Amino acid sequence: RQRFGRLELKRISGRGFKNDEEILIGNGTIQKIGIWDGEEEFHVRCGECRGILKKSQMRMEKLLINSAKKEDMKDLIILCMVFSQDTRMFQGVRGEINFLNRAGQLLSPMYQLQRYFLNRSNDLFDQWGYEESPKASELHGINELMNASDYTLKGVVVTKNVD
Numbered sequence: 001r002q003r004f005g006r007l008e009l010k011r012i013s014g015r016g017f018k019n020d021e022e023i024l025i026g027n028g029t030i031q032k033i034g035i036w037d038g039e040e041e042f043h044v045r046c047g048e049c050r051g052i053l054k055k056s057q058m059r060m061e062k063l064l065i066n067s068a069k070k071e072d073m074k075d076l077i078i079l080c081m082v083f084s085q086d087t088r089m090f091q092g093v094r095g096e097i098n099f100l101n102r103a104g105q106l107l108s109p110m111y112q113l114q115r116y117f118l119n120r121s122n123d124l125f126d127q128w129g130y131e132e133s134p135k136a137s138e139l140h141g142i143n144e145l146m147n148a149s150d151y152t153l154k155g156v157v158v159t160k161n162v163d
């Protein structure tokens with residue numbers, strides 16, 4: 001099991017293979033990043049929100065989460081978008097990613113990105129895009145307010161709390 005900031009993950013399936021790549025991100029800077037290749041699925045948790053994450057190389061394919069405190073839902077979605085290394089997430093960077101840690105050093109790129117988008121989720125969501133919500137009975141779409149809606153952040157769905 002693994003941790004990516006407040007994101008907690010447990011592998012469900014697949015294997016990732018990391019390759020160092022130079023990535024040209026949205027603010028016109030080149031970052032060196034271990035890019036994970038391959039299909040992978042993870043149980044994911046952030047605080048009280050739990051879900052299933054499906055990803056492939058630089059692509060979040062699907063994110064299924066439960067209803068929870070909105071701040072936990074939103075952070076889970078963002079952390080999953082960053083963790084999946086989605087190209088839309090890389091392209092969403094506008095500002096600088098030059099955060100210093102409590103030690104005077106630059107955070108590593110993936111941790112810059114996590115810190116950046118948790119701070120500027122609109123830069124991510126505007127870049128990410130919306131699509132028609134699934135109409136499968138047990139799922140609904142979710143907008144940037146973490147409200148159920150007819151449109152959803154692409155690839156994200158929420159389960160209803162049903163007894």
Ligand SMILES: Nc1nc2c(ncn2[C@@H]2O[C@H](COP(=O)(O)OP(=O)(O)OP(=O)(O)O)[C@@H](O)[C@H]2O)c(=O)[nH]1
Nearest residue numbers: 002003004015016017034036037040083084110111
């Ligand atoms: N897609 C994918 N990402 C992983 C996997 N394992 C670790 N990561 C992520 O890849 C990055 C590098 O993590 P590691 O190789 O485990 O170790 P690290 O380079 O010291 O980085 P940290 O452990 O996060 O401090 C981290 O952001 C992890 O979240 C994996 O199996 N699949």
